[PDB]
Short mmCIF file of C-alpha atoms and ligand atoms in Angstrom, two decimals:
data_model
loop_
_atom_site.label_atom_id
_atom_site.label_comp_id
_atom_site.label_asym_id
_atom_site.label_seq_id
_atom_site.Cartn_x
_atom_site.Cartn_y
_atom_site.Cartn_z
CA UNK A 1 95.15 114.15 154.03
CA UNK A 2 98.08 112.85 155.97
CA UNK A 3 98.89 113.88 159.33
CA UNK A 4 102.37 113.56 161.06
CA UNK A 5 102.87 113.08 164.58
CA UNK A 6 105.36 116.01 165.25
CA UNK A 7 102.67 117.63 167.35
CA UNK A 8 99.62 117.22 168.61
CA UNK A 9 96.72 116.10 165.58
CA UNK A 10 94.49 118.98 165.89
CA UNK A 11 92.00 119.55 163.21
CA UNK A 12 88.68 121.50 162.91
CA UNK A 13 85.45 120.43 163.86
CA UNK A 14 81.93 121.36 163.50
CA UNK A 15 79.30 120.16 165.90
CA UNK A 16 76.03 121.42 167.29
CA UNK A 17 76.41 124.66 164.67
CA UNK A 18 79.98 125.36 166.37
CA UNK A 19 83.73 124.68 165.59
CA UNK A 20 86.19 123.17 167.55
CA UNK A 21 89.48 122.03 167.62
CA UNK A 22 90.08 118.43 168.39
CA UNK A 23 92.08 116.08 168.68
CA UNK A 24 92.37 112.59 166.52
CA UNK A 25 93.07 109.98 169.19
CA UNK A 26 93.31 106.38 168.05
CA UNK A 27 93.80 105.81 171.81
CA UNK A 28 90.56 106.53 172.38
CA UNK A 29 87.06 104.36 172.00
CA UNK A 30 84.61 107.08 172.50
CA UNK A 31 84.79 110.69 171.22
CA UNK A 32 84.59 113.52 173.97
CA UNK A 33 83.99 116.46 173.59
CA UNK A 34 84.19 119.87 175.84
CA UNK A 35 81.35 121.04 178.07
CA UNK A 36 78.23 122.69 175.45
CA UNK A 37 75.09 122.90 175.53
CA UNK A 38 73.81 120.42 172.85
CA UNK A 39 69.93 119.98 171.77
CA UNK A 40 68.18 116.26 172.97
CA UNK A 41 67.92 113.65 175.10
CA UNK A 42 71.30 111.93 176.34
CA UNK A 43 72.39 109.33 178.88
CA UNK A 44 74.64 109.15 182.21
CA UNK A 45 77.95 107.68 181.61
CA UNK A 46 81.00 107.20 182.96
CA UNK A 47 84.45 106.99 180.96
CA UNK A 48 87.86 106.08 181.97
CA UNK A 49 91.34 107.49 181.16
CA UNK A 50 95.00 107.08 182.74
CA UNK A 51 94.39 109.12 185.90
CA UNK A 52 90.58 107.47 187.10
CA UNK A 53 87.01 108.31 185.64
CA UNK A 54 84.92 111.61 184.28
CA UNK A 55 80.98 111.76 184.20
CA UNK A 56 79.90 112.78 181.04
CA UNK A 57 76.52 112.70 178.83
CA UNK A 58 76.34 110.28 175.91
CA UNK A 59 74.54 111.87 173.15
CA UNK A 60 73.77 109.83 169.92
CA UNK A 61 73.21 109.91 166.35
CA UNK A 62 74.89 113.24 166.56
CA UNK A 63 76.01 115.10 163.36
CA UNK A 64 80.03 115.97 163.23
CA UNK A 65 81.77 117.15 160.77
CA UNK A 66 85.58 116.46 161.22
CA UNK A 67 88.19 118.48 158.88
CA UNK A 68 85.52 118.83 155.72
CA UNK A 69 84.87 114.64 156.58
CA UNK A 70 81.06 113.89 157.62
CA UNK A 71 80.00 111.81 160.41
CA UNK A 72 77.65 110.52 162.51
CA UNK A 73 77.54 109.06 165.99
CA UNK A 74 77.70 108.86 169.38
CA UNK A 75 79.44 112.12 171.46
CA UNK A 76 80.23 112.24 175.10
CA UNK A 77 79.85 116.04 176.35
CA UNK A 78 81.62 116.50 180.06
CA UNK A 79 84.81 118.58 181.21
CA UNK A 80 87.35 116.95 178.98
CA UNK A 81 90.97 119.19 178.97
CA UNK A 82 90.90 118.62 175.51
CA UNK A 83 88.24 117.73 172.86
CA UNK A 84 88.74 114.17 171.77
CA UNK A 85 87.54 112.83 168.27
CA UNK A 86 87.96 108.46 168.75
CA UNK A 87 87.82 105.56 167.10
CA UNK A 88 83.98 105.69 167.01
CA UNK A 89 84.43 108.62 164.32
CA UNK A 90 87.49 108.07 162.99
CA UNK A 91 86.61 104.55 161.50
CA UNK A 92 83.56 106.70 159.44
CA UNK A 93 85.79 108.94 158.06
CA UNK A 94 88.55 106.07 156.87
CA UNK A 95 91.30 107.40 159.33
CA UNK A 96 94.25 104.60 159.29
CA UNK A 97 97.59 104.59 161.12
CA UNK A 98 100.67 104.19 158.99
CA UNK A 99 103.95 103.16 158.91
CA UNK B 1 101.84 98.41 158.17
CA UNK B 2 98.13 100.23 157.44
CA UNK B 3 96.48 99.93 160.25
CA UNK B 4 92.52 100.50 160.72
CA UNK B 5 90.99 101.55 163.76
CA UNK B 6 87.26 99.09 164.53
CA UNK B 7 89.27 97.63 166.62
CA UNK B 8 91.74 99.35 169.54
CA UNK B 9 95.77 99.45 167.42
CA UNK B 10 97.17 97.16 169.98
CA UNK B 11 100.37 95.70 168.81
CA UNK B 12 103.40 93.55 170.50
CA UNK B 13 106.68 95.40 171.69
CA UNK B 14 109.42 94.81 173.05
CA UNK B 15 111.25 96.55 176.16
CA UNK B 16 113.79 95.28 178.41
CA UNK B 17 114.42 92.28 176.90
CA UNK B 18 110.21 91.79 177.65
CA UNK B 19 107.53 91.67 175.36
CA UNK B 20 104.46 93.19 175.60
CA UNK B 21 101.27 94.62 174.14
CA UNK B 22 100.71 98.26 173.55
CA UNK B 23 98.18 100.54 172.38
CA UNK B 24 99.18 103.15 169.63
CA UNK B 25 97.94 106.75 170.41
CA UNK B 26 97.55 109.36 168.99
CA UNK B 27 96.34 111.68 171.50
CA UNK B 28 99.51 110.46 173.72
CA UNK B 29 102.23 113.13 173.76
CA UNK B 30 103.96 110.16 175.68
CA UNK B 31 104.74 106.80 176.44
CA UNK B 32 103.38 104.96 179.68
CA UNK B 33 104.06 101.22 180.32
CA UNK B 34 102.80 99.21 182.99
CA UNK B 35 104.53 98.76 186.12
CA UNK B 36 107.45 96.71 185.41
CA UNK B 37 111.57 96.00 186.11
CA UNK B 38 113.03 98.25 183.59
CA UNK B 39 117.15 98.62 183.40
CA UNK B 40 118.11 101.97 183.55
CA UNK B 41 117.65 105.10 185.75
CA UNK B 42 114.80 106.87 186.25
CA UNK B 43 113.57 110.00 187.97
CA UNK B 44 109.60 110.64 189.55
CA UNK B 45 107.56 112.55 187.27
CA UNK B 46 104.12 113.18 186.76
CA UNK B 47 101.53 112.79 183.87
CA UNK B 48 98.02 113.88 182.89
CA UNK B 49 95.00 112.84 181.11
CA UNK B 50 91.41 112.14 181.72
CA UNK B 51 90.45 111.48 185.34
CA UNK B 52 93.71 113.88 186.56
CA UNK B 53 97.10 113.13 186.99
CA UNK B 54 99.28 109.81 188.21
CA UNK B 55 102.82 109.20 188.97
CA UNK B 56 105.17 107.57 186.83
CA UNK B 57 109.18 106.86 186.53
CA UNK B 58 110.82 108.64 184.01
CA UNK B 59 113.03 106.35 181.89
CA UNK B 60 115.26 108.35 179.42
CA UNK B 61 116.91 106.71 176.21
CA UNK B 62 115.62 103.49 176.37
CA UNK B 63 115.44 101.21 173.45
CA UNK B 64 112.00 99.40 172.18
CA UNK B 65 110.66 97.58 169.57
CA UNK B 66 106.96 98.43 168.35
CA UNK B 67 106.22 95.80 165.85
CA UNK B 68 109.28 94.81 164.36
CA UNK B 69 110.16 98.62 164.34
CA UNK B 70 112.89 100.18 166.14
CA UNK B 71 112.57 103.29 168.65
CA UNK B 72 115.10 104.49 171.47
CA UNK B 73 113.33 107.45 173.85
CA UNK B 74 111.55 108.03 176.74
CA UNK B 75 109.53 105.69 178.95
CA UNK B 76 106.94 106.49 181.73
CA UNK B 77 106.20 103.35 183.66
CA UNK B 78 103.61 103.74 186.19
CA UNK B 79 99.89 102.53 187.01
CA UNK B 80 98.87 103.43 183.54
CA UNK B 81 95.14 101.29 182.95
CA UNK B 82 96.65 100.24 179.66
CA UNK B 83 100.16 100.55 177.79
CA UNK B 84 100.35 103.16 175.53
CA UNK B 85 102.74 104.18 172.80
CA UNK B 86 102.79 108.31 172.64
CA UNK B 87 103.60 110.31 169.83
CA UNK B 88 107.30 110.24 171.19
CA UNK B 89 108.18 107.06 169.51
CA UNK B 90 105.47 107.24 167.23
CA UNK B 91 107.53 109.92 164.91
CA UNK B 92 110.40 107.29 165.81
CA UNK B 93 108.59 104.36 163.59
CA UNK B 94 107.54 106.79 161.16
CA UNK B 95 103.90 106.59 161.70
CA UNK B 96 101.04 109.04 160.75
CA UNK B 97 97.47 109.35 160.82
CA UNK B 98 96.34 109.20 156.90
CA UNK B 99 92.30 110.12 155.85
C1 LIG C 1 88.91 102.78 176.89
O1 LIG C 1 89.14 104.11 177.44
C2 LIG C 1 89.45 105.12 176.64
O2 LIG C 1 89.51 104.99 175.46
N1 LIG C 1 89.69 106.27 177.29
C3 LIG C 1 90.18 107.42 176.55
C4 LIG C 1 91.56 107.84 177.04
O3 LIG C 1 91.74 108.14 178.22
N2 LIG C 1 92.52 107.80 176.09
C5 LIG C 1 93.95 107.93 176.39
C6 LIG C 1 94.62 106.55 176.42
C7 LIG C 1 94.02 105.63 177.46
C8 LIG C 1 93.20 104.51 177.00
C9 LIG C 1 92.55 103.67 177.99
C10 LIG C 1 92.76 103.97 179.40
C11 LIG C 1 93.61 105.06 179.87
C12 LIG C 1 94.25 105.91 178.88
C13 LIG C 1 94.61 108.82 175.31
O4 LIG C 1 94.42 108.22 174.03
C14 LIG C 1 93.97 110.21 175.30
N3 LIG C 1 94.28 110.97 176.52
C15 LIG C 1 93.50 112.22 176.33
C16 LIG C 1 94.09 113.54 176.80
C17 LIG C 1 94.97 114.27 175.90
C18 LIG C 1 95.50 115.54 176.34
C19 LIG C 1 95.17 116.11 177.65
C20 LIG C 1 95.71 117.52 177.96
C21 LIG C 1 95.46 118.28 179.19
C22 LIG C 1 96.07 119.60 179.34
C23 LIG C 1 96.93 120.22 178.34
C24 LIG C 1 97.17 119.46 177.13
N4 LIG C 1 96.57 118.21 177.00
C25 LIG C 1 94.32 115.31 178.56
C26 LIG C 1 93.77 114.03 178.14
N5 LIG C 1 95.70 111.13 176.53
C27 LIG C 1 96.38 111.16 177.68
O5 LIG C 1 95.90 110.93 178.79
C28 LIG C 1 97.86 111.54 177.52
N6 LIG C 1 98.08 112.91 177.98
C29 LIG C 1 98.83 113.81 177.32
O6 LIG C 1 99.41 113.60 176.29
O7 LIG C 1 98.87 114.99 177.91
C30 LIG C 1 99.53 116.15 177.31
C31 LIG C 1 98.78 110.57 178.29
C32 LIG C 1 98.43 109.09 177.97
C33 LIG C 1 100.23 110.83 177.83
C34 LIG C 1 98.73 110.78 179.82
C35 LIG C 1 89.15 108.57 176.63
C36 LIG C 1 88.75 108.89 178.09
C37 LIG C 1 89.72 109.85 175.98
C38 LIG C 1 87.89 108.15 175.86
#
């Protein structure tokens, strides 16, 4: 599909049995996603953005399916305003910028 | 240009007369350059993202170049980690996300 920039790029997402919305940020390395309770083992981390850092929990190999696309990967879970799908996930799914 | 995303979409701009590199976002609803000398006028204004807010100057109308492509709109400049190009000029260039 092709997505213009008019608004914010806000597709569905299923993780961890749930759907989201999220965002498709090519300004972003790592994929973050809103405070849940996912199964497993993760790992302290800390990311940064334009206003300092959050602490969130870096899960891998986790299964995401991003508007009908598979994927598979890392996910950071932590109190994000927003939930972020990055570059990480985007490359798997063959996301490009265009113009 | 098509541009893929295993590596961050930096490109070269050009504002004030000054060139620059900039990261193309997405998940930016706008603009944020680095602390720099910018003619024009500007008012305070503040801006949010991961890690809380910061404070920026509010440039209105102000022309750049984003890879040989022409944009005239807003610019934040401020202690932004990284410059980013927002969805505010991106719909200037013509860009979209494509999957
Ligand atoms: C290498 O670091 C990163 O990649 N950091 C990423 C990051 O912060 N991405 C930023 C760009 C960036 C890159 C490197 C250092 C600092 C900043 C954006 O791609 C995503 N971010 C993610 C984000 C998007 C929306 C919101 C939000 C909050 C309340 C209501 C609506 N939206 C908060 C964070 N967007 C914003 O912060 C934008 N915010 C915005 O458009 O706000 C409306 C700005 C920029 C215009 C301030 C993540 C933490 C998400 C992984």
């Amino acid at each position: 599909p092709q997505i213009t920039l008019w608004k914010r790029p806000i597709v569905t997402v299923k993780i961890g049995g749930q759907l989201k919305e999220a965002l498709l940020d090519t300004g972003a390395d790592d994929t973050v996603i809103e405070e849940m309770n996912l199964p497993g083992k993760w790992k302290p981390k800390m990311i940064g953005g334009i206003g300092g850092f959050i602490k969130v929990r870096q899960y891998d190999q986790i299964i995401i399916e991003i508007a009908g696309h598979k994927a598979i990967g890392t996910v950071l879970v932590g109190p994000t305003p927003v939930n972020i799908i990055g570059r990480n996930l985007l490359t798997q799914i063959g996301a490009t910028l265009n113009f």
